Write a protein that binds this DNA or RNA. Structure first.
Ligand SMILES: [K+]
Ligand SMILES: [Mg+2]
Ligand SMILES: [Mg+2]
Ligand SMILES: [Mg+2]
Ligand SMILES: [Mg+2]
Ligand SMILES: [Mg+2]
Ligand SMILES: [Mg+2]
Ligand SMILES: [Mg+2]
Ligand SMILES: [Mg+2]
Ligand SMILES: [Mg+2]
Ligand SMILES: [Mg+2]
Ligand SMILES: [Mg+2]
Lengths: 70, 176, 113
RNA sequence: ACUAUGCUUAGCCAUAAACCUAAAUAAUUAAAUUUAACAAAACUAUUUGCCAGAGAACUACUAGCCAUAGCUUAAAACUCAAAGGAC
RNA sequence: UACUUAAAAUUUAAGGAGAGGGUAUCAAGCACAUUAAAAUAGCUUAAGACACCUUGCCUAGCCACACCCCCACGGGACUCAGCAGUG
C-alpha cells in the first residue's frame, strides 16, 4: 500500500527536482561528455606511444563518438 | 536466383506420376493439373522433390538431417521472396531468421555425424556454414574505434621492422 | 630419449581451433572435486599441439604427446593420434563407419572397400 | 468552442499492474501431503535466471544507447528495530 | 663425507595434474601468437582476461625485507625492524 505511494511520492519529488535544475544538468552533461571524449583520445594516444610510434598511424583521426553526431 | 525453377507446364505432385500413365489426356485437363492453376505452395513441393533427388541418396526418406535441411532451404528462399515485397512484415521477418538459425543448428549436427553428407549438402544447396565463434565480442563505438587503432598501430610497427631488416641486410651484403 | 618435465605426458582433448600454422589449439578437460559439494566438475585447459601435416579439424578428439623440448612458449605437445574425426568416426569395437549411435555400414557385412 | 494527439507514409523512442503478480520441461496423485494462511490441490526431478532486513533508492556515479527534463545498468554514507505478508 | 670419483645436505633455474583474497559500475586486453623459405593473422577473455584494491602464509616451519630511491653503479632527506635504553 504505502510502498507504491512512497515510490510515487519519491518519484514525484525527483521529477520536480529535475525540472528545477534542468538547465544546470544540461551543462553538467555537456561537460561530462567532453571529459569522456578527452579520456578516450588520451587512452588512444597511450597505445601508439607505448608501441613506439612517435606519431599516430597515417590517415588516423580519433573519431568523435560522444558529440552530437546523430 | 537458383539454377532450377519448376516450369509452368509441370504437373502437381499429386498427379506427377499418374498423368504419364494415362494414355491420352486433354490439353485443358493437363492445364488444370499443371503448376499454372495451382497455389505457390504447390510449386514449392515440386522444388523440394527435385532437390531431394539431386542430393539425398534415398529420396523416399524425409526425416534425415540432410532432408530436413533441404526442407528448410526451400522455406528460407520462400520467406526471402515474401520479404522482398512485404518489407514491413515482422512476423515473416521472424520466420526467416528462425529458419536460418534452425538450418545452422541442423548443419552443425550433420557435420558432427556424417561429414561426407554434410559437404555434399552444403555444396549442392549452396549454403556456406561458419563455425560458432568461441568467444562473443561486444560491439560499440568506443570499442570499434580503439580496436581499429590497435590493429593500425601494430601494422605500422611491423612495417617499420621489415624496413629496418632490409636496410640492415643490404648494408651487410655490401660489406661482404 | 628423456621425456618431458610437464605432468601432461599424454593428454586427450577436442580441437577447438586450427587457425595457426601447423598448430592446433586443443581443449582438454579433467574432473576436479569441489570440496564443499563433494561433486566433480570439469576443469578445462588449452594445449597448443604441433600438427605437422595440418590434418586436424575443429571438433575432432585427439591424443597429444608431450614434446621433449618445448617448441615455443606455448607449443609443448605434438599430435600423436586423432581418436575421433569430426563426422568421420570409425567404431573401435567393430571397426565400421558410424554416424552417431548408428552404423553407416552394418557389422554383419564385409565390404572390404 | 477548439488545438497537440488518436489516422496514413517514412523513421525514432523501448516504456506498462508488458499480470495468469504462475520460468520452462517431463512426471506422480500415493507417498496416512490443509503442512501456515489466502490464491491456483499437492509434490519430485532437470537446467538456467534471480533473491539474502527496511528506508535512503525506479536515487548518486559509471558504461552503452538516433534516446539530451530520456531508458537500461546500479551503490555507499547515514537512520531505524523493525519493515513486510495472510488472516 | 667418501673416492680421486658417489652418497648426502643445501640451493638455483626452467616449468605445470590440481588448488589459491576482493571489486564485473574493472568487459574487453592491445602484440599479449604460430611458422622458421622468414611467412600466417593470430594470442588471453563472462569457465572472469586486463585494470584496481587489500593482505605476509604454507606454520616442527616458510617467504620477503635490512635507513630511503622496487634494485643500489650512482644519488639522497645518511642507518638500533640485534640487546638494553631514550624522544
Ligand atoms: K626495500
Ligand atoms: Mg486535430
Ligand atoms: Mg493481471
Ligand atoms: Mg521507470
Ligand atoms: Mg535514472
Ligand atoms: Mg545515471
Ligand atoms: Mg546497506
Ligand atoms: Mg559506481
Ligand atoms: Mg629505523
Ligand atoms: Mg634496499
Ligand atoms: Mg630495541
Ligand atoms: Mg644494524
Amino acid at each position: 500500500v504505502l510502498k507504491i505511494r512512497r515510490r510515487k511520492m519519491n518519484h514525484h519529488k525527483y521529477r520536480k527536482l529535475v525540472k528545477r535544475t534542468r538547465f544546470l544538468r544540461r551543462k553538467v552533461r555537456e561537460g561530462r561528455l567532453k571529459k569522456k571524449q578527452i579520456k578516450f583520445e588520451k587512452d588512444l594516444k597511450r597505445i601508439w606511444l607505448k608501441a613506439g610510434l612517435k606519431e599516430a598511424p597515417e590517415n588516423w583521426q580519433t573519431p568523435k563518438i560522444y558529440l552530437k553526431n546523430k | 536466383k537458383q539454377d532450377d525453377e519448376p516450369p509452368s507446364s509441370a504437373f502437381i505432385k499429386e498427379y506427377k506420376d499418374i498423368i504419364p500413365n494415362i494414355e491420352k489426356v486433354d490439353d485443358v485437363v493437363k492445364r488444370i493439373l499443371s503448376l499454372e492453376m495451382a497455389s505457390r505452395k504447390e510449386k514449392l513441393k515440386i522444388k523440394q522433390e527435385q532437390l531431394m533427388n539431386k542430393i539425398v541418396e534415398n529420396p523416399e526418406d524425409s526425416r534425415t538431417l540432410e532432408a530436413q535441411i533441404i526442407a528448410l532451404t526451400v522455406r528460407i528462399r520462400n520467406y526471402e521472396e515474401h520479404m522482398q515485397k512485404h518489407r514491413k512484415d515482422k512476423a515473416h521477418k521472424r520466420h526467416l531468421l528462425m529458419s536460418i538459425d534452425r538450418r545452422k543448428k541442423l548443419l552443425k549436427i550433420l557435420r558432427q555425424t556424417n561429414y561426407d553428407v554434410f559437404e555434399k549438402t552444403c555444396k549442392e544447396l549452396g549454403v556456406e556454414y561458419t563455425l560458432p565463434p568461441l568467444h562473443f565480442q561486444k560491439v560499440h563505438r568506443r570499442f570499434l574505434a580503439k580496436k581499429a587503432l590497435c590493429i593500425r598501430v601494430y601494422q605500422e610497427v611491423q612495417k617499420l621492422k621489415k624496413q629496418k631488416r632490409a636496410l640492415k641486410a643490404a648494408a651487410a651484403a655490401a660489406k661482404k | 630419449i628423456v621425456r618431458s618435465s610437464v605432468h601432461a605426458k599424454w593428454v586427450v582433448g577436442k580441437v577447438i581451433g586450427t587457425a595457426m600454422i601447423k598448430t592446433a589449439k586443443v581443449r582438454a578437460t579433467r574432473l576436479v572435486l569441489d570440496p564443499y559439494l563433494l561433486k566433480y566438475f570439469n576443469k578445462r585447459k588449452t594445449y597448443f599441439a604441433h600438427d605437422a601435416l595440418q590434418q586436424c579439424s575443429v571438433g575432432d578428439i585427439v591424443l597429444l604427446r608431450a614434446l621433449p623440448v618445448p617448441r615455443s612458449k606455448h607449443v609443448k605437445h605434438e599430435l600423436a593420434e586423432i581418436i575421433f574425426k569430426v563426422g568421420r568416426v570409425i567404431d573401435p569395437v567393430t571397426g565400421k563407419p558410424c554416424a552417431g549411435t548408428a552404423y553407416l555400414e552394418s557389422p554383419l557385412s564385409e565390404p572390404r572397400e
